[PDB]
């Protein structure tokens, strides 16, 4: 149910708030993405 961030390599829904480091649950790989929006998006099909 939900998520927020992600690990570039070991793609694993993660997340946290301020001063929670910027690492991952396993992969140190301090990168982290920000997975899609819930607000669905629409497109012109042309």
């Amino acid at each position: 149910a939900t998520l927020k961030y992600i690990c570039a390599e070991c793609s694993s829904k993660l997340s946290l708030s301020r001063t929670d480091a910027v690492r991952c649950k396993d992969c140190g790989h301090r990168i982290l993405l920000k997975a899609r929006t819930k607000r669905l998006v629409q497109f012109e099909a042309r």
């Binding site: 140190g28 790989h29 990168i31």
Partner: protein
């Protein structure tokens, strides 16, 4: 070989792909036997 000495962590065996994304400098350590 390339290394990333960052405070709050060891020294990661740095890599291209990451130095780019992170805006680091894909460099490395220079060591010489200083004799006294």
């Amino acid at each position: 070989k390339p290394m990333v000495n960052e405070s709050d962590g060891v020294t990661h065996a740095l890599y291209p792909q990451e130095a780019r994304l992170r805006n680091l400098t894909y460099s490395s350590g220079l060591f010489v036997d200083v004799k006294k």
